[PDB]
Design a protein around this ligand. Structure first.
Ligand SMILES: OC[C@H]1O[C@@H](O)[C@H](O)[C@@H](O)[C@@H]1O
Ligand SMILES: OC[C@H]1O[C@@H](O)[C@H](O)[C@@H](O)[C@@H]1O
Ligand SMILES: [K+]
Ligand SMILES: [K+]
Lengths: 822, 822
């Protein structure tokens, strides 16, 4: 059961019906201006920050879902329809939506008129451009009137949705029917006061009519599907004063048989300097100069086409760093196109704004943006470098950090909680990934403030020291790191004990004292603490490095001595020192996070995959047996069936959802990587397939959400909805699966001084070639892979055998030809 | 131009079409459980607190407005319609909605089936009850299936609308088709964890089927008007897991011509003790005991009719304290029914939850609840006493207060700002009003904490001292009170200077220093500081009262020496010491608030209304000429046409709306009362009529909002929407207009030791009788009123002349007969 198909050649997912299981969206824009666009044109646009500068209005939990967005009502003979199907839902002769890289096309045809709209955000522009092609597909001349529609948001999305007592009186527009390139509407709410920015909605023709008042265009008592103006066949030329500003133009079109016409529409974000805000001395008329400029940049079809081609070439360049050619077209399209595109989206969006995240409370996460860098550093390392400096600037002098920052201002806030004790080490992970990818050791000398405070700058390396020493100096009675509010699992809140509803577990005040410790953070510390030691060694700091490796040794030993339950790693100790994630308890016996992470860190790894005695093997067998399902690995088993006061939010989910028995996808890749470490390629690859979009496309009707991107959660076996996803697009799962597949399964992974080539994928991919650009050289990596259990590669480079699996980095302009035998 | 009419005998407003200019609501409930109910059954319900315990979901800014509520879909041979008209919008043969005191009835008829629903919140119950009567009005048998529908909210409304990434997995329900009185659905989201409460939706018959999943009931791609289940003609028996829980039952009914059937539905809020939360040892099944009991209390039509009659008698009793019989039926319906009913609603809701206030950021206001007490103390003095203690408990030791408190917890917060310097004086105003009404001097001895701190309790009188002294100790260079963040006008922010958007002026950090002073607070202190001085003397604190009288006299002199512009009172001095509200500036020349309040306080009052040299008369004449429009008096003139950085939020509204040139109705009765003080009854009554619902009913298409309640703002003459109101129901306009008409125009006003009888209403009301119950005796006050300017009453009581206009309070069970000659 499928609603579409992948088009690899066009780098598109083609949706062949309006009637998907749920709205399926694309993101347009990769720089500072973003649009969410569903396959029914639903969604919204924002500049830098979805909460603070949201241009256009979108209703979450609408009835029906996704009724609202960028509509073009066609009136042909009194019949009104939209090519996006919603909101009018007229029967279409033909419908198709293609979601591509930074653009989508939606096409609807009815009664001899085909209307195709290309939507995209052009490079270097803070604007969503639409090119509409209307074609007369009948054998007689046709006429119709097209009515564009977008509903503006009053910038601050939180105020827009809750502060009507003020905001129904502040909506302001200007209307310019006869501008330099066509007609434009300006949405300028609050430009009278503190905003130096306004929006424009314009078209490259002189429109017959316009409307700026929603209530007049739609009509009293009517939904969008029943809009009065398009049914009457004539705009009302409404000029809004408060209430609900919109942008709408009417355009009369006439077409000979087989003839088409292109219209270009632009939604743009403009700023003026304070000294030039106004066209008039009375300060009532906005200075339209930047809007006129933008509209002249997209005044013709040739301009749109040229910008769409520049975007296509930009994607080709971005995707040229890592690619694979294998026997498996599903694996290839993920590695080559979709997983990398999704890593761009998560880099830009963090967990802020999707069709599930509402673009209000959540900004750029400290943990989330570090995990995202893992899968992003090969794509645009300069932008990764800058994101590291932004993130690190929100860290405090003691090594702890704001959990997230406001994207518009880059200042940290406590809006979704504070004191998550895994956050500091994630900074080490992101910088080490960055340095291995780029060889830019100089980033460690970059001056970086604490909490953006002028004069507080220290080199970025010293921030890593603060992160490292935060964990060293905050260990509990077993020598494991204190958990604080929660670790990577936000719902494991051991210092909470809340019995009173009203406040989120993520923000509620926690109690001081206790001895709550995390095995997860212990594993994270052994893994990334070893990276910090290497960075210190490279900087000549022999005493810092030696001491660092000693602490890493103590914590590893603490995990084996006090974090081991017998057949799997313990999860935590609670506030009173009682173990969590032990077979001694009836529920929450085994939790996935320490099994994946401890083994990734090398803890408990013995002689080989068939060392029965090794703790890593026992842990992974337990995972397989107790957490394994056909849709992936659940977070813990059994789920909790009653509220456990001492554990916080985790048991408040019904069993099989989110952190209580859900398949929490971000943790799956840790087990996939763990299995490659022990030498079980076939098992690692099997788990990759269970959660990976291209492999789940055939069950589109079960997964429900986009078949082309990872989601945060799939409902687990304990859920009546087992198999169904929530929270698509915005998840650490995108970066960490990209890591897993590109670096551990396919095995091509940068290290500080060379490229490790260490395939561990099992027999289902018996040969493949990776082309990898690293440190200015191209490595063509040809793999013959028996998939024999535990077998690891030997290499020949440019015809000479080499020792080991690391190819020392070659000087730039090389093609290095690596032949791999597994 | 009208959409209904008043029915005085039934104490109802009758809306005779679905097609009003805006949804027109009623409030059900007077105690702890409340429903907002539109004339199309739209709205929602909550227990105590609209933010934290919202039982049912409502979308503000829905398209169309108010699509969502308590619906009853009728399927009659495949034809589907709702008697509320929305959401199906099928053509109705007859439609009527009647909004009454605590209940509403909505009736719709189509093709021989009439469906009438009575909605109400019964006394002493946390439930909304609907009694539905279906009548076959045709000449042949009918069969129809009735589908009830309500959509649940996940309690925390803020979370409900923003936190889908969590809350789409937590919705949980139980279904009980075979309960003790009929069928019921339980909505129990988070009852698993910290919540001790759940909602029930039940009907008093064994239903044919049920639905609890919205998406199954409504159908993919469908709006509520197109819901699949009612169109199919049978329930889907859906059991929700996450997503959107609803309550729906189906009942097939068969009726002979003329036959009717009653069905009783209940939406109830239930709590269990922690120890009795669960029916079963495993804690998986909710204890239904309180829901079964509730459903048993409304299992019959007779039980509903009894509760409805008890609610009618409760309102007859509440309205027996003050009533008027005159020759003006518009005046009498406002005084006897609608204004008192509104004051009950504002007492209960403050500014929290309406069709404009979103029941999220706003709780119970310190200023707001004190102003509302002014019009409520005579209705239920025992509840007003309790509210005073609740408010005063959120005051700090230095006399300043939290600006509002959370209704569920009664604890103050800064969610809409802090340091509004008019706040502390309002407490004195509320307590003086209460003691005058009740003679309950012992309230001053009640122990009241500061900021709810156990152990911090001082007598309530000492809180008034802290109020009084905060003003004394915070006056500026001219002897006028420092303004702080704002005074009563929340948009006058003289300490703000914000040039960067992103944060509300109400919450944004303010600048220390400057000399900004408020003439409004000066007046407020003269008026209420004088009451404090009286209270101090009555408490035996002679020297404290002598000191208080002296400070009142200082501030009074300062208003005339430094707060007088020439022809009207100044508004403020800004942060720099420059006057605000002076004829020296081009915009904002004259502000309404100090003209009304300074003259209420007696400042500038001369020999009589024809003393053209008295500053009060000059000021009121400038008000009439500069601020007076046919819709009421605007806040200031001219409105600001550009942003004035030193004045904060005010100039951010486009001219003619809200605080920038809007008719801000709460300030009008200050001018009405001021005009009675100077002896111009005719002009006072004129201003009362310009804004009063019964007088504006004849321009319902202009006003747009409910024609039976005051609104916060009517757009002013500078707006294109001149005459159109926003923010109905929840405004201090209701209490202050009640004070103006009952106590100053009709002239019947409690004082500490007697009842003042001082009519000042002009010639349009030449005879009337007030019946007033005060301090346990009833006063029958018969007024013969020439309305000649400046003529004041003389009284005879029980046949004997009295001196002056104060009738000393008679002992209980008197009928005191007062004859009044003006
Ligand atoms: O916070 C509440 C306040 O918000 C301001 O924007 C409005 O202008 C005021 O009228 C309102 O009282
Ligand atoms: O604040 C964000 C956190 O909210 C919690 O309610 C969810 O369970 C987490 O998955 C999420 O990461
Ligand atoms: K997480
Ligand atoms: K106010």
């Amino acid at each position: 059961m499928r609603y579409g198909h992948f088009d690899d050649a066009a780098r598109e997912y083609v949706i062949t019906t309006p009637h998907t299981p749920y709205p399926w969206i694309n993101y347009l824009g990769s720089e500072q201006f973003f649009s969410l666009l569903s396959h029914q044109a639903g969604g919204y646009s924002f500049y830098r920050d979805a909460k603070m500068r949201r241009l256009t209005r979108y209703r979450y939990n609408n009835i029906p879902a996704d009724a609202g967005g960028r509509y073009l009502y066609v009136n042909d003979g009194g019949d009104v329809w939209t090519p996006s199907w919603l909101p009018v839902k007229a029967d279409l002769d033909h419908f198709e939506a293609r979601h591509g890289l930074g653009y989508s096309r939606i096409t609807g045809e009815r009664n001899g008129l085909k209307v195709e709209t290309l939507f995209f955000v052009p490079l270097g522009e803070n604007a969503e451009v639409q090119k509409v092609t209307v074609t007369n597909t009948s054998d007689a001349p046709k006429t119709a009137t097209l009515f564009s529609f977008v509903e503006f948001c009053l910038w601050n999305a939180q105020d827009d949705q809750t502060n009507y007592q003020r905001n129904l009186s502040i909506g302001e527009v200007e209307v310019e029917q006869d501008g330099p390139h066509g007609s434009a509407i300006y949405h300028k709410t609050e430009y009278r006061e503190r905003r130096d920015h306004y929006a424009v909605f314009g078209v490259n023709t002189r429109a017959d009519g316009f409307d700026t008042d929603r209530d007049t265009f739609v009509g009293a008592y009517n939904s969008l599907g029943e809009a009065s103006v398009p049914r009457a066949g004539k705009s009302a030329d409404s000029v809004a004063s408060g209430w609900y500003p919109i942008g709408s133009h009417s355009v009369a079109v006439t077409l000979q048989p087989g003839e088409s016409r292109d219209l270009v529409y632009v939604l743009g974000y403009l700023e003026n300097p304070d000294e030039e805000k106004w066209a008039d001395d009375a300060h009532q008329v906005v200075n339209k100069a930047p809007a006129h400029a933008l509209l002249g940049r997209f005044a013709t079809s040739e301009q749109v086409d040229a910008a769409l081609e520049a975007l296509n070439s930009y994607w080709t360049n971005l995707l040229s760093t890592y690619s694979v050619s294998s026997t498996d077209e599903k694996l290839d399209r993920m590695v080559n196109i979709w997983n990398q595109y999704q890593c761009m989206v998560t880099f830009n969006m963090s967990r802020s704004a999707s069709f599930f995240e509402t673009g209000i409370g959540r900004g750029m996460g400290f943990r989330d943006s570090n995990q995202d860098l893992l899968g992003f550093v090969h794509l645009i390392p300069e932008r990764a470098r800058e994101r590291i400096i932004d993130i690190a600037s929100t860290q405090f002098a003691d090594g702890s950090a704001y959990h997230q920052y406001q994207p518009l201002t880059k200042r940290g806030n406590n809006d979704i909680g504070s004191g998550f004790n895994d956050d500091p080490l994630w900074l080490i992970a992101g910088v080490a990934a960055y340095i291995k990818e780029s060889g830019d050791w100089g980033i460690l000398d970059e001056p970086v403030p604490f909490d953006n405070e002028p004069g507080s700058e220290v080199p970025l390396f010293e921030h890593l020291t603060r992160s490292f020493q935060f964990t060293v100096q905050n260990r509990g009675p077993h020598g494991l790191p204190l958990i604080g509010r929660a670790d990577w699992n936000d719902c494991l809140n051991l210092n909470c004990f809340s019995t009173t509803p009203g406040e989120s577990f993520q923000t509620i005040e926690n109690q001081a004292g206790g001895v709550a410790e995390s095995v997860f953070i212990a594993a994270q510390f052994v893994l990334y603490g070893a990276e910090y030691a290497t960075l210190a060694e490279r900087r000549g700091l022999a005493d810092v490095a030696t001491e660092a490796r000693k602490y890493v040794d103590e914590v590893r030993a603490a995990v084996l001595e006090h974090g081991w339950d017998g057949q799997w790693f313990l999860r935590a100790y609670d506030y009173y020192g009682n173990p969590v994630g032990t077979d001694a308890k009836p529920e929450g016996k085994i939790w996935i996070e320490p099994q994946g992470f401890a083994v990734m860190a090398g803890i408990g790894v013995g002689e080989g995959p068939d060392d029965a005695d090794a703790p890593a093997v026992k842990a992974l067998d337990s995972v397989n047996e107790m957490l394994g399902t056909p849709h992936g690995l659940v977070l813990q088993y059994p789920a909790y069936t009653t509220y456990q006061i001492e554990l916080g939010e985790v048991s408040t989910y019904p069993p099989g959802y989110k952190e209580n028995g859900g398949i929490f996808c971000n943790a799956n890749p840790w087990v996939i990587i763990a299995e490659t470490v022990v030498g079980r390629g076939a098992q690692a690859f099997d788990y990759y397939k269970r959660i990976t979009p291209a492999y789940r496309e055939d069950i589109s009707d079960t997964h429900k959400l986009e078949p082309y991107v990872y989601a945060q959660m799939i409902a687990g076996k304990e859920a009546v909805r087992a198999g169904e996803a929530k929270n698509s697009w915005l998840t650490g799962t995108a970066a960490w699966n990209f890591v897993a597949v590109s670096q551990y399964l396919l095995g091509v992974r940068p290290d500080y001084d060379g490229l490790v080539v260490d395939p561990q994928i099992g027999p289902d991919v018996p040969s493949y070639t990776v082309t990898r650009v690293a440190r200015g050289a191209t490595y063509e990596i040809t793999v013959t892979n028996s998939g024999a259990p535990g077998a690891r590669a030997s290499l020949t480079v440019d015809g000479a055998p080499v020792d080991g699996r690391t190819v020392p980095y070659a000087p730039a302009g090389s093609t290095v030809r690596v032949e791999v035998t597994v």
